[PDB]
Amino acid sequence: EIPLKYGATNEGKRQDPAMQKFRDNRLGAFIHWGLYAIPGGEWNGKVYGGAAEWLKSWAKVPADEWLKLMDQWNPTKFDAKKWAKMAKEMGTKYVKITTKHHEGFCLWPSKYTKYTVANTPYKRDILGELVKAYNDEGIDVHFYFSVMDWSNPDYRYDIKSKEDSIAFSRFLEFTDNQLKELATRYPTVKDFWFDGTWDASVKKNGWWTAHAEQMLKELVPGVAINSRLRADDKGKRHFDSNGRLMGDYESGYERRLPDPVKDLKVTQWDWEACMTIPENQWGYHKDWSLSYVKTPIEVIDRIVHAVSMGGNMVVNFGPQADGDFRPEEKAMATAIGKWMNRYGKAVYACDYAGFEKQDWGYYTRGKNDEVYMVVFNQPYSERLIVKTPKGITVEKATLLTTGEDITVVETTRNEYNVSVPKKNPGEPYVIQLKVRAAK
Ligand SMILES: C[C@@H]1N[C@@H](C#Cc2ccccc2)[C@H](O)[C@@H]1O
Could you tell me the distance, in angstroms and rounded to a whole number, from the CA of residue 299 to the centre of ligand 1? Predict the structure, then answer.
């Protein structure tokens, strides 16, 4: 056992109503919008295949020249009420917004830097408009914040001198100022999701990460803080040197997910995954033909996968420079929305069911011990295998959409065949089980 000043604080999972809400929400959308949307992956006539929001890096653009894009920031089609309506219709319960990405341009008019929305043709507080619009739809808002900042020359990648240490100390104060500003300007915020915390400079300054967490929790009652912020005394990130989770939820599953058989450890803490639609594009990229683009069922599979293992999922969108969404993203949101409207009782407010994974799909467990079978892979056998934990029996099965009764046949002690529906649903579908535990 190691002694630590800046390690974990939470015992197990938070069970206050604010965390229960963060959890129960389950499905969110991510918005990556920044100056990178203007060039859209292309610089000086060359299209780069890397993530469009990192184009400054790929094309080696100096900060002064990158930040001049502010002069073209004029999203005339932007309408926050329309954005919120799109998120509502998708069935998202929350949205995570890039308040500032690595480029350093702020979507709110920060008083601590000139690189903000206020100094663009458009002038308006985008972020404030979004907060208000989403909240009006009953949709929680979470703020993405990049610690790394390519616009501020006090940023350091590592501390190699006393000069570096002085500069970086200023940078942290500047960061604290932006954070307090966001918290006090927009007090309905439910979560801060830190990114760009991987450099040695941050790892060496664990104390600050713990401080940022406590500071924001004092300013916003019940606010959530992601693990990715946090580093301990020894520079160990996410989980401290005694294996304990820092922050309120685990936040490392990015464009990947834990294995449903081998990574059951994740059910012991709250966590959230995020994903892109193309292979690796978060900001708007002009050419989606350059990598594989997921279909709606592929996205829905990942969402349900997350919930089945006790985690949330956040699907990313990268709005155009003009403030509208591309057609592929509108189609996706609409498709997800249709399916969630029909089957979302197996997603919202659900969790890990404690059953052995089977090949047909995923189990989720409801708040009143409902066990849902979410079927993505239809067996030619016409039988869905259900192996129960010790002491649990299956009393009934019901097709969720129609209420029709589904035959259940005991095959062995602790195992059943649940029939497929008489008519093939023709899409991923849900069978609800009634289970009983021995007494
Ligand atoms: C949520 C995503 N995190 C950002 C990143 C990254 C990254 C950078 C270097 C190596 C591996 C991952 C992406 O640009 C996006 O914000």
Answer: 20
Q: 365, 349 in Cβ contact below 8 A?
A: no
Residue located nearest, by CA, to atom 13 of ligand 1: 282
User: Token pair for residue 153?
Assistant: 């020359």
Q: Is there a single domain that holds both residue 355 and residue 317? A: no
Give the structural domain span for 362.
349-439
Question: In terms of domains, do 328 and 439 share one?
Answer: no
**Do 80 and 197 share a domain, yes or no?**
yes
Q: Whose CA is nearest to atom 3 of ligand 1?
A: 195
Please tell me the total count of domains within the chain.
2
Q: Are the C-beta atoms of 375 and 273 separated by less than 8 Å?
A: no
Tell whether 376 is covered by a domain: yes
- Compute the radius of gyration of the chain from its Cα atoms: 23
Dist. CA 314 → ligand 1 center (Å):
15
- 258 and 382 belong to one structural domain: no
CATH number at residue 387: 2.60.40.1180
Question: DSSP label at 24?
Answer: H
Q: What's the gap in Å between 150 CA and the centre of ligand 1?
A: 14
Shared-domain flag, residues 263 and 288 = yes
Determination approach: X-ray
Q: Which residues 6+ apart lie within 8 Å of 255 measured at CB?
A: 274, 275, 276, 279, 280
Gap between the Cα atoms of 323 and 282, Å rounded: 15
Q: Is the CB of 53 under 6 A from ligand 1?
A: yes
Q: Is the CB of 272 under 6 A from ligand 1?
A: no
What is the whole-number distance in angstroms between the Cα of residue 403 and the centre of ligand 1? 44
Dist CA 309 CA 207 (whole Å): 32
Domain boundary among 348, 368, 383: 348
What CA–CA distance (Å, rounded) separates 68 from 76? 18
> 196 CA distance to ligand 1 centroid (A)?
7
Resolution (Å units):
1.8
